[PDB]
Ligand binder design. Structure first.
Ligand SMILES: Nc1nc2c(ncn2[C@@H]2O[C@H](COP(=O)(O)OP(=O)(O)O)[C@@H](O)[C@H]2O)c(=O)[nH]1
Ligand SMILES: Nc1nc2c(ncn2[C@@H]2O[C@H](COP(=O)(O)OP(=O)(O)O)[C@@H](O)[C@H]2O)c(=O)[nH]1
Ligand SMILES: *CC(=O)c1c[nH]c2ccccc12
Ligand SMILES: *CC(=O)c1c[nH]c2ccccc12
Ligand SMILES: [Mg+2]
Ligand SMILES: [Mg+2]
Lengths: 170, 170
């Protein structure tokens, strides 16, 4: 029937993957979501005038040597690669997540969006220009979000769905 | 793409799920593939003029409780439901796999193909009419295969892809 999209949210612990996912699904901010809970959520949404169903996997935790994890990446069609703008390491680890995805899916072009989360925080350590430069280099959209205020949350997920559309159209 | 199709091979132990997958992927019979090993394969093929990528999960394991199973039944786009023509119980067991898949997908219309494997053996116990009747009742194709001779093997997988195309453009 209507088009389904398998989305996977990856990124360092603490960056806001669960908060972003819950804002999208449940439209509220949860500020203490169990950091170890990994789960999938479905929601029917309208993007660009068309209804579609998002199946979203909020990852956690053991990253390497995990059959379950590798399976999510094989199956996933698009990936939100999240870092927190006050957490430089989480930004400088993005490449690790990207490498793992390209490895498991064995493809040079996989739909991804770079998400700089925690935009509401006054102290950043990652400049917008830096994130922009990395995303441009990767050939992927970059979007700043705040799960706390909800700014950019729909935009992050809709943009990824749009990247999946193109991939299919090419 | 290059469309990708995610296929899942299911059915009772010993019916030939591995042998069918390995024939398709590696072009030879197997008589010594561990019954408990669950693994996935990729192959690029042309089906009806469409160059596409198959990602095939060869399932194994009869665990009453399985998070992985509930997962691949959710994400798999089409299901090869295999029984062996010399094994009456495996034929009966088809119902079990079908119903599991339906409940996980919450759908009566999940792309599947009924596969009657080991067609090379004279030791037959499940008649062609029985299998054709079961498939008709499910509204899915039935294909006779032999992973030994390779008879019907491409046709089984390709026909599942055709079922997926029908469903997607519904
Ligand atoms: N200030 C701010 N805090 C956030 C934001 N998103 C998540 N958090 C907080 O960051 C911590 C980790 O968030 P969480 O969703 O559990 O991160 P995860 O481990 O990546 O899933 C929690 O205390 C959240 O309240 C945000 O956009 N802004
Ligand atoms: N004669 C014959 N033997 C087969 C066929 N398919 C599988 N086998 C044999 O049946 C046994 C079980 O096959 P396997 O693929 O491992 O079954 P699985 O547990 O469903 O994967 C092995 O000894 C295979 O050699 C077939 O089409 N014809
Ligand atoms: C590991 C996993 O879940 C996997 C790998 N290939 C697949 C194809 C279809 C469904 C699940 C698959
Ligand atoms: C179990 C599984 O593989 C699964 C469930 N929802 C998903 C969304 C995206 C990728 C994998 C998913
Ligand atoms: Mg989390
Ligand atoms: Mg096997």
């Amino acid at each position: 029937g209507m088009t389904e999209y398998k989305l996977v949210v990856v990124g360092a612990v603490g960056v806001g993957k669960s908060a972003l996912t819950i804002q999208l699904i449940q439209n509220h901010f949860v500020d203490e979501y169990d950091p170890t809970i990994e789960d999938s959520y479905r929601k029917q949404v309208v993007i660009d005038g068309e209804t579609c169903l998002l199946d979203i996997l909020d990852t956690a935790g053991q990253e390497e040597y995990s059959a379950m994890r590798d399976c999510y990446m094989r199956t996933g069609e698009g990936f939100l690669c999240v870092f927190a703008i006050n957490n430089t390491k989480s930004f400088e680890d993005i490449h690790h997540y990207r490498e793992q995805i390209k490895r498991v899916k064995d493809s040079e072009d996989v739909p991804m969006v770079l998400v700089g989360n925690k935009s509401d925080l006054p102290s950043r350590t990652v400049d917008t220009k830096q994130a922009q430069d990395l995303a441009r280099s990767y050939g992927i959209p970059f979007i700043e979000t705040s799960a706390k205020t909800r700014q950019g949350v729909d935009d992050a997920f809709y943009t990824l769905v749009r990247e999946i559309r193109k991939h299919k159209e090419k």
